[PDB]
Design a protein around this motif. Sequence first.
Motif, PDB file in Angstrom:
ATOM      1  N   UNK A  85       0.804  -1.226   0.000  1.00  0.00           N
ATOM      2  CA  UNK A  85       0.000   0.000   0.000  1.00  0.00           C
ATOM      3  C   UNK A  85       0.840   1.281   0.000  1.00  0.00           C
ATOM      4  N   UNK A  86       0.275   2.369  -0.526  1.00  0.00           N
ATOM      5  CA  UNK A  86       0.809   3.733  -0.437  1.00  0.00           C
ATOM      6  C   UNK A  86       0.607   4.538  -1.717  1.00  0.00           C
ATOM      7  N   UNK A  87       0.448   5.856  -1.635  1.00  0.00           N
ATOM      8  CA  UNK A  87       0.406   6.709  -2.827  1.00  0.00           C
ATOM      9  C   UNK A  87       1.782   6.851  -3.486  1.00  0.00           C
TER      10      UNK A  87
ATOM     11  N   UNK B 130      -3.847  14.536   7.974  1.00  0.00           N
ATOM     12  CA  UNK B 130      -3.085  13.397   7.461  1.00  0.00           C
ATOM     13  C   UNK B 130      -2.590  13.720   6.059  1.00  0.00           C
ATOM     14  N   UNK B 131      -1.278  13.759   5.853  1.00  0.00           N
ATOM     15  CA  UNK B 131      -0.665  13.978   4.540  1.00  0.00           C
ATOM     16  C   UNK B 131       0.177  12.750   4.202  1.00  0.00           C
ATOM     17  N   UNK B 132      -0.263  11.953   3.235  1.00  0.00           N
ATOM     18  CA  UNK B 132       0.451  10.760   2.768  1.00  0.00           C
ATOM     19  C   UNK B 132       0.662   9.624   3.786  1.00  0.00           C
ATOM     20  N   UNK B 133       0.037   9.660   4.967  1.00  0.00           N
ATOM     21  CA  UNK B 133       0.179   8.627   6.001  1.00  0.00           C
ATOM     22  C   UNK B 133      -0.592   7.347   5.668  1.00  0.00           C
ATOM     23  N   UNK B 134      -0.161   6.219   6.232  1.00  0.00           N
ATOM     24  CA  UNK B 134      -0.947   4.986   6.287  1.00  0.00           C
ATOM     25  C   UNK B 134      -1.366   4.731   7.734  1.00  0.00           C
ATOM     26  N   UNK B 135      -2.661   4.599   7.988  1.00  0.00           N
ATOM     27  CA  UNK B 135      -3.195   4.311   9.315  1.00  0.00           C
ATOM     28  C   UNK B 135      -3.984   2.999   9.313  1.00  0.00           C
ATOM     29  N   UNK B 136      -3.564   2.017  10.107  1.00  0.00           N
ATOM     30  CA  UNK B 136      -4.365   0.848  10.468  1.00  0.00           C
ATOM     31  C   UNK B 136      -4.789   1.010  11.925  1.00  0.00           C
ATOM     32  N   UNK B 137      -6.059   1.308  12.183  1.00  0.00           N
ATOM     33  CA  UNK B 137      -6.584   1.529  13.537  1.00  0.00           C
ATOM     34  C   UNK B 137      -7.785   0.626  13.818  1.00  0.00           C
TER      35      UNK B 137
ATOM     36  N   UNK C  76      -2.794  -0.827  -3.087  1.00  0.00           N
ATOM     37  CA  UNK C  76      -3.609   0.392  -3.054  1.00  0.00           C
ATOM     38  C   UNK C  76      -2.805   1.692  -3.042  1.00  0.00           C
ATOM     39  N   UNK C  77      -3.422   2.774  -3.514  1.00  0.00           N
ATOM     40  CA  UNK C  77      -2.932   4.155  -3.425  1.00  0.00           C
ATOM     41  C   UNK C  77      -3.031   4.933  -4.733  1.00  0.00           C
ATOM     42  N   UNK C  78      -3.226   6.249  -4.671  1.00  0.00           N
ATOM     43  CA  UNK C  78      -3.274   7.099  -5.865  1.00  0.00           C
ATOM     44  C   UNK C  78      -1.891   7.366  -6.463  1.00  0.00           C
TER      45      UNK C  78
ATOM     46  N   UNK D   8      -8.705  16.757   7.861  1.00  0.00           N
ATOM     47  CA  UNK D   8      -8.176  16.815   6.500  1.00  0.00           C
ATOM     48  C   UNK D   8      -7.348  15.577   6.187  1.00  0.00           C
TER      49      UNK D   8
ATOM     50  N   UNK E 194      -5.108  14.156   2.943  1.00  0.00           N
ATOM     51  CA  UNK E 194      -4.491  14.426   1.643  1.00  0.00           C
ATOM     52  C   UNK E 194      -3.629  13.216   1.291  1.00  0.00           C
ATOM     53  N   UNK E 195      -4.049  12.412   0.323  1.00  0.00           N
ATOM     54  CA  UNK E 195      -3.316  11.226  -0.122  1.00  0.00           C
ATOM     55  C   UNK E 195      -3.054  10.134   0.928  1.00  0.00           C
ATOM     56  N   UNK E 196      -3.678  10.165   2.110  1.00  0.00           N
ATOM     57  CA  UNK E 196      -3.516   9.118   3.128  1.00  0.00           C
ATOM     58  C   UNK E 196      -4.300   7.854   2.776  1.00  0.00           C
ATOM     59  N   UNK E 197      -3.878   6.695   3.280  1.00  0.00           N
ATOM     60  CA  UNK E 197      -4.702   5.484   3.270  1.00  0.00           C
ATOM     61  C   UNK E 197      -5.084   5.121   4.702  1.00  0.00           C
TER      62      UNK E 197
ATOM     63  N   UNK F 209      -7.250   2.358   7.022  1.00  0.00           N
ATOM     64  CA  UNK F 209      -8.060   1.186   7.335  1.00  0.00           C
ATOM     65  C   UNK F 209      -8.497   1.310   8.788  1.00  0.00           C
TER      66      UNK F 209
ATOM     67  N   UNK G 231       6.551   0.061  -7.697  1.00  0.00           N
ATOM     68  CA  UNK G 231       6.095  -1.007  -6.783  1.00  0.00           C
ATOM     69  C   UNK G 231       6.433  -2.428  -7.203  1.00  0.00           C
TER      70      UNK G 231
END
Lengths: 73, 73, 73, 74, 74, 74
Positions: A27-29, A48-55, B27-29, B47, B49-52, B54, F42
């Motif tokens: 995963x990731x942009x 959140x700017x470009x972060x990945x969060x699994x919560x 995943x990701x843009x 906000x 911006x480009x985050x993923x 879950x 990737x």
Amino acid sequence: VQIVYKPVDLSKVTSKCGSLGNIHHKPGGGQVEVKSEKLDFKDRVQSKIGSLDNITHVPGGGNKKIETHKLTF
Amino acid sequence: VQIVYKPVDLSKVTSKCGSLGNIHHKPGGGQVEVKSEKLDFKDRVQSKIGSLDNITHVPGGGNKKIETHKLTF
Amino acid sequence: VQIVYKPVDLSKVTSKCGSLGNIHHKPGGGQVEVKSEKLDFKDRVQSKIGSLDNITHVPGGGNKKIETHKLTF
Amino acid sequence: VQIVYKPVDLSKVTSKCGSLGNIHHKPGGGQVEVKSEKLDFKDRVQSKIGSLDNITHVPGGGNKKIETHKLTFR
Amino acid sequence: VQIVYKPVDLSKVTSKCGSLGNIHHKPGGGQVEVKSEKLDFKDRVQSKIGSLDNITHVPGGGNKKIETHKLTFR
Amino acid sequence: VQIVYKPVDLSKVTSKCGSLGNIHHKPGGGQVEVKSEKLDFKDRVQSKIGSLDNITHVPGGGNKKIETHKLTFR
């Protein structure tokens, strides 16, 4: 007179809850950019700017098991 | 007089719930861009911006199992 | 006089609920751009720009199993 | 009785396959510009920019010669 | 009774396969520019920029020669 | 009775497969510029920039010669 009281319990009670057995593969942009002269964040802001969060929150998933076994002669 | 009391329980009670067994494959843009002179966020702003993200909440998924096994002669 | 009380329970009770067994294969937008002089967000604003969100809530999916097994002579 | 079995074989069998005897004079002179921004590719990319590779695959070009000579007397 | 068995074989069987006898004179002179920014690739990339490799695969080109001579008298 | 079994073989079987006898005069003169920033890959990348490799694989080119001679008298 005879009474043979021999009930059998092999039961299972299970919770499988929250985030289980998932696959997150690469995963990731590609690119994320934010350009400004100011960022001004000042009351209960989440950014959140470009972060990945699994919560995961599981306040549920509890099990209650009750048995009674009463023999009165 | 004889009584044989031998009920058998092999039952299963289960909660498979929330986010289970999913596949998230690459995943990701591609590109995300925000251009400004100011970003100004000032009461309860969220906000992304480009985050993923879950995110899983399970307040549910509870199990209750009740048995009574009563013999009166 | 004899009584053979031997009921068998082989039952299954299951909850399978929320987000289960899905495939999300290469998700995402190509290009996202936001151009401004100002972004100004000021009371309970949610903004998503190019983010991916997988959000699952399960307050449901609970199981209740009740048995009574009564023998009176 | 006389027998004179004198066949003469001067034959030639030839295969000329692929890129033979070519002239390529100043190939790929001049100018190639690729200017690229803000692209997304979700699947396989094959790309050539200003390439002049020489690539040769020969799974074939095999030769088989079979020569049976039999003389039977009585 | 005279038998002469004098077959003459001067034959030739030939394979000329692939890239043979070519002239490449100043290949890839001039100018290649690739300017690239903010790109995403989610899958396999093969890329050639200004390349002039010589790549040769020969699974073939095999030779099989089978001569059988038999002379039977009575 | 006379028999004169004198077959003559001067024949030739030949394989010329792949890249033979080529001229490559000043290849890859001139200019290659790759300018790259903020890229994401990737998956697997194969990349060649300004390469002039000489790569040869020969799984083939095998030779098999079989010569059976039998003379039977009575």
